């Protein structure tokens, strides 16, 4: 009988991370005839939506002490007490600060367990990166995160790259018929610059040679700026806006039907699930080679392309070649190119990364 604690600061209760965590917990609580999972949250308030925890046993440390030294002390004490009630074999920290908490509460509680980091954002784009050193071993969702962890003096031997899961699909979205315009897809929150750089998307497409259309599924405060920019660039007649969609891939299947490539032009990403989703439907992806995720998914010339951050010329080149057919991606084999990301194999590799360190 083995018990796994998943711990972190309170989250919103909606987000890719929550979805991954709940699925990994439900999967564990079946695995070996249910080996048990619980959660512990460090909270300043009870504003976390609880829906995603419906079937998940969780406890909380509440402290809104304004001085962080005292709040952390209180957190560590509360977690220490929980550890004594619960006696987990393994503690997995979904953020970096919780590695510190887990480490200090292990010393305080006198309990024996292994601490794993499992961060869901680039260490260099979030607050408490140096707290990663308090975990025993590391579960990297990307090569970039592994690199970031190594940079803090952690041995590559103590870090397993586990990626993130996606569901196997039984439908392929085919390319457009020959002599139809290229069809580009953008799926995500709209930011003109900042993280998403829709500006870069528009600048590239405006410079491309050949017939193309762009389908944009998403919304954000920069909608009007982005529409204005498309008008400025003289491309508005080739852009179709869907706004926010609850079922983007249903819209793709039912309304768009044929896709040349999904495009992502981001300055950075926590984990670009959109790329994975696209490749699960056999859609090739042209992405900025940003921290982090795209380089672990995209195999240049096989399921899409990578361009160096800011290399808009390179992006344009990638576009031109897929529009002309100079480079062709085979939609029928693209789903097989992300084998290690599919739910069952992902979980197998994740499970082995944990139990191999014991
Ligand atoms: O109109 C949309 C646009 C995006 N997404 C989903 O949002 C996720 C990532 O989008 P985003 O760029 O917002 O990343 P985040 O900021 O949420 O990390 C993906 O799983 C998409 O399928 C969606 O459901 N509807």
From Swiss-Prot:
GO terms for biological process: lipopolysaccharide core region biosynthetic process. This is Lipopolysaccharide 1,6-galactosyltransferase. It is an enzyme of class 2 (transferase). Pathway: Bacterial outer membrane biogenesis; LPS core biosynthesis. It comes from the Bacteria. UDP binds at residues 245, 277. Keywords: Glycosyltransferase, Lipopolysaccharide biosynthesis, Transferase. One of its GO terms (molecular function) is glycosyltransferase activity. It catalyses: alpha-D-Glc-(1->3)-[L-alpha-D-Hep-(1->7)]-4-O-PO3(2-)-L-alpha-D-Hep-(1->3)-4-O-PO3(2-)-L-alpha-D-Hep-(1->5)-[alpha-Kdo-(2->4)]-alpha-Kdo-(2->6)-lipid A + UDP-alpha-D-galactose = alpha-D-Gal-(1->6)-alpha-D-Glc-(1->3)-[L-alpha-D-Hep-(1->7)]-4-O-PO3(2-)-L-alpha-D-Hep-(1->3)-4-O-PO3(2-)-L-alpha-D-Hep-(1->5)-[alpha-Kdo-(2->4)]-alpha-Kdo-(2->6)-lipid A + UDP + H(+). The keyword Glycosyltransferase applies. It holds the Pfam family Glyco_transf_4. PANTHER family: GLYCOSYLTRANSFERASE. Disruption phenotype: Mutant lacks the alpha l,6-linked D-galactosyl residue of the core lipopolysaccharide. Deletion mutant shows a lower invasive capacity than the wild type, but the difference is not statistically significant. Galactosyltransferase involved in the biosynthesis of the core oligosaccharide region of lipopolysaccharide (LPS). Catalyzes the addition of galactose from UDP-galactose to the first glucose residue of the LPS outer core. Belongs to the glycosyltransferase group 1 family. Glycosyltransferase 4 subfamily. The keyword Transferase applies. SUPFAM superfamilies: UDP-Glycosyltransferase/glycogen phosphorylase. It comes from Salmonella typhimurium (strain LT2 / SGSC1412 / ATCC 700720). InterPro entries: Glyco_trans_1, Glyco_trans_4-like_N. Its EC number is 2.4.1.-. CDD domains: GT4_GT28_WabH-like.
